[PDB]
Design an enzyme around this catalytic site. Structure first.
Site, PDB file in Angstrom:
ATOM      1  N   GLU A  37      43.767  43.269  38.448  1.00 26.51           N
ATOM      2  CA  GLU A  37      42.800  44.004  39.590  1.00 26.51           C
ATOM      3  C   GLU A  37      43.249  45.523  39.511  1.00 26.51           C
ATOM      4  OE1 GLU A  37      39.969  45.589  42.085  1.00 26.51           O
ATOM      5  OE2 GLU A  37      39.665  43.872  40.859  1.00 26.51           O
ATOM      6  N   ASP A  68      49.612  55.257  36.660  1.00 25.10           N
ATOM      7  CA  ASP A  68      48.625  55.871  35.797  1.00 25.10           C
ATOM      8  C   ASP A  68      49.006  57.553  35.827  1.00 25.10           C
ATOM      9  OD1 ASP A  68      46.906  57.451  37.655  1.00 25.10           O
ATOM     10  OD2 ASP A  68      45.806  55.446  38.205  1.00 25.10           O
ATOM     11  N   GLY A  96      38.346  44.574  44.287  1.00 25.65           N
ATOM     12  CA  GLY A  96      39.161  45.718  45.221  1.00 25.65           C
ATOM     13  C   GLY A  96      40.609  45.360  45.320  1.00 25.65           C
ATOM     14  N   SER A  98      42.332  46.084  47.875  1.00 27.28           N
ATOM     15  CA  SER A  98      42.588  45.502  49.365  1.00 27.28           C
ATOM     16  C   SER A  98      42.810  44.131  49.024  1.00 27.28           C
ATOM     17  CB  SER A  98      41.578  45.916  50.146  1.00 27.28           C
ATOM     18  OG  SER A  98      40.309  45.509  49.711  1.00 27.28           O
TER      19      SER A  98
END
Ligand SMILES: CNc1cccc2cc(C(=O)Nc3ccc(C(=O)O)cc3)c(=O)[nH]c12
Length: 196
Positions: A37, A68, A96, A98
């Protein structure tokens, strides 16, 4: 403040029914899905043409970081909800990032952008403090390190190199151009995935 209330209901929702958001919490699939994710978010930044290199690291303490070299999550305080746009992204539901935040005992966020390094620490999805500048830099990017909650995950709690390697190799295939490094600090193993 509606927004704080909403966020906590979301986090609570995810910790109560983790299966609905991350998958099975005993067999390792959910645990590895936590990594994927976070990586998927970095892939979006590559797809948008800002990220060239993604570095996935298995740390010795059985956390995983993803770095990244994209633009960095925007850090400006959203007028509308009173906190950094980054904190909105880290905490608002809709699977997500979260969800991973909610199911991590701790998460570390490091953003490099507009000449500044910003850092925030979360526990069970809750920020210890607002995002804050810790230093200056010439670089850009987003680094998320997370330590999975052992309240949520049982049985298979250790990250498995091969499982991460298979999926990251798949992802590099699907997203030609993106370059992915995987490194295991537990034994120095590493791989570089890059296609066409
Ligand atoms: C490890 N990486 C990683 C983990 C988790 C979440 C994210 C989220 C983003 C993202 O939201 N980037 C982004 C950049 C610029 C703007 C803009 O409007 O300038 C809007 C969004 C990202 O780049 N990297 C991530």
């Amino acid at each position: 403040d509606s927004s704080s209330i909403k966020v906590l209901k979301g986090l609570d929702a995810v910790r109560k029914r983790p299966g609905m958001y991350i998958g099975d919490t005993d067999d390792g699939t959910g645990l590895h899905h936590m990594v994927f994710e976070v990586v998927d978010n970095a892939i979006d930044e590559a797809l948008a043409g800002h990220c060239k290199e993604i570095i996935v690291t298995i740390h010795a303490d059985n956390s995983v970081s993803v770095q990244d070299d994209g633009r960095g999550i925007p850090t400006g305080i959203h007028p509308e909800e009173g906190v950094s746009a980054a904190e909105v992204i880290m905490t608002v539901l809709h699977v997500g990032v979260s969800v991973v935040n909610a199911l991590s005992q701790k998460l570390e966020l490091v953003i490099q952008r507009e000449g500044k390094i910003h850092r925030q620490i979360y526990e069970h999805g809750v920020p210890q403090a607002p995002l804050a500048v810790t230093g200056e830099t010439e670089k850009t990017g987003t680094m998320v390190r997370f330590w999975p909650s052992l309240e949520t995950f049982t049985n298979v709690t250790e990250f498995e190199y091969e499982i991460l390697a298979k999926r990251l190799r798949e992802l590099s295939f699907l997203n030609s151009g993106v370059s992915i490094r995987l490194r295991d600090k537990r034994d120095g193993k590493e791989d570089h995935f890059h296609y066409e």
